Every structure is written in structure tokens, then in C-alpha cells.
């Protein structure tokens, strides 16, 4: 039938037009790196987003460092039960986990540690690296100097913790402040290392939520993540 041949031909033209668009879409989808911004309400993640930008269920931020395009996604009006909608992000390059070094009000740091544990050990997130932003460092410093801090009696193992030799305190860094902040970092690094079978890594950073370096931190950590993924793929 001529009509059947005409319909088949028209379907083929439509299909090749669709695929011509899809190739153009693929070229840009492969050049973009998707990021999941995760954290707590009291952590300064919203301020970090505000810096990066200079009823919705999810917020999208577009930024580019050099000529690389980064697409960071912040979770909006989602309930606090994350075990289902977090599987959607099993193919992002990295998860940016923002933590506030705290010191209703409760021990937010322990719940941050538990959330990081769940993220790290989740079945679908075992290949995803975490860029850990230990945020609000100036508040931690000022509260540790005042002698009223969360660590001493909420983390009793702190009383016998000594600053690592690898520590690199700032010139004006009080020894006790660096001890506290490196203890908090090691708390997360214990979890990170206990199950780091080489498929993913954690990149801890000390941030203050108003830094022009956070963009560079994410850029360098993503570069490292993908370089290690490629090195693994090629047996080094």
C-alpha cells in the first residue's frame, strides 16, 4: 500500500529529526557536572548557595568555573525522610555535605555524623564522593575561645585527642581551636575511611559560608574525583 509506505517514511523522518535533536542534547549533557547540595537547615548552606549565585520541590543553581559547567541541586520542599528521594542522585559527580560546627537546640553535630554515615554507607551512594564543608568555623573558634563549647562533654573521646602532626593551623590559629576543629574533622574521617573501598572518597574542608574559595574547592575536588575514577577505570 502506498499510504503505508508514506506513513513509514514520515515516521522515519520524524525519528531522524528527534535523534538529531537528541545528539545535540547529549553533547551538552555530557559536558555538565551535576552536584547535590545537602545539609541541615541551621547549616549555612543557603548562604553558600547565595554566594555561588553571584513551594518549589528542588532548587537548581547553574555556575561555571573556567569553561566547565556545574549544575548544583538543592533540595527544597522535601520532607525530612530522605531514604527514597536520595536514590535519584546516585550519578552526580559529588555530594556537597555542609555541616555546622555547633557549640529547639540540640547536639546537631552527632545527627550530622549519623546522616553522613547513612549517606556514605547507602547501597546506591557507594560510588559517590562527598565534598564535606565543615562550615561556620569562625563561630566554632569564638565559642571554643570563650570556654563554652559542645565538644568536651558531648564527645568525651575529645579529652584525650591531640592535634595531628599533619595539621596546618593558620598563623593566628589558637592551639585549642585547631585541636577542636581537627577533632571534628577526624570524626567524619573515621566514618569515611571505615568503608572507603576505593570507589569514593571524602574531601573535608574548613569553610565560613562566605568564601570565594568554595567554588574553587568544589572544582578541585570534582577534578580529583573524576581523575581517580578514570585512573581506576584504566587499572591506573
Amino acid at each position: 500500500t502506498e499510504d503505508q509506505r508514506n506513513e513509514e517514511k514520515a515516521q522515519r523522518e520524524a525519528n531522524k529529526k528527534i535523534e538529531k535533536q537528541l545528539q545535540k542534547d547529549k553533547q551538552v549533557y555530557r559536558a555538565t557536572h551535576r552536584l547535590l547540595l545537602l545539609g541541615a537547615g541551621e547549616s549555612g548552606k543557603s548562604t553558600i548557595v547565595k554566594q555561588m549565585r553571584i513551594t518549589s520541590g528542588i532548587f537548581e543553581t547553574k555556575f561555571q568555573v573556567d569553561k566547565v559547567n556545574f549544575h548544583m541541586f538543592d533540595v527544597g520542599a522535601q520532607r525530612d525522610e530522605r531514604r527514597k528521594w536520595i536514590q535519584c542522585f546516585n550519578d552526580v559527580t559529588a555530594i556537597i555535605f555542609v555541616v555546622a560546627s555547633s557549640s529547639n537546640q540540640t547536639n546537631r553535630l552527632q545527627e550530622a555524623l549519623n546522616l553522613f554515615k547513612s549517606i556514605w554507607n547507602n547501597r546506591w551512594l557507594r560510588t559517590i564522593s562527598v565534598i564535606l564543608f565543615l562550615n561556620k568555623q569562625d563561630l566554632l573558634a569564638e565559642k571554643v575561645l570563650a570556654g563554652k563549647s559542645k565538644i568536651e562533654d558531648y564527645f568525651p573521646e575529645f579529652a584525650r585527642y591531640t592535634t595531628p602532626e599533619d595539621a596546618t593551623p593558620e598563623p593566628g590559629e589558637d592551639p585549642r581551636v585547631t585541636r577542636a576543629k581537627y577533632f571534628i574533622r577526624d570524626e567524619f574521617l573515621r566514618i569515611s575511611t571505615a568503608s572507603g573501598d576505593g570507589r569514593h572518597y571524602c574531601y573535608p574542608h574548613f569553610t565560613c559560608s562566605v568564601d570565594t574559595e568554595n567554588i574553587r574547592r568544589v572544582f578541585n575536588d570534582c577534578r580529583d574525583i573524576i581523575q581517580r575514577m578514570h585512573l581506576r577505570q584504566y587499572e591506573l
Binding site: 515516521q11 525519528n15 535523534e19 549533557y29
Partner: peptide, 23 residues
């Protein structure tokens, strides 16, 4: 989750529509 909503013809495997999604 690449942001596309493709309508297929299963008999021929031809794509009939490819709808780009806002989210």
C-alpha cells in the same frame, strides 16, 4: 532523569516524540 520524556513506537522502535522537561 536526563530530563526527557520520549514516546516510542515499539513495533518499529521509532521515536514519535521527545519532550524536554523543565525539571
Amino acid at each position: 532523569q536526563d530530563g526527557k520524556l520520549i514516546i516510542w513506537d515499539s513495533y518499529t522502535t521509532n521515536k514519535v516524540h521527545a519532550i524536554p522537561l523543565r525539571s
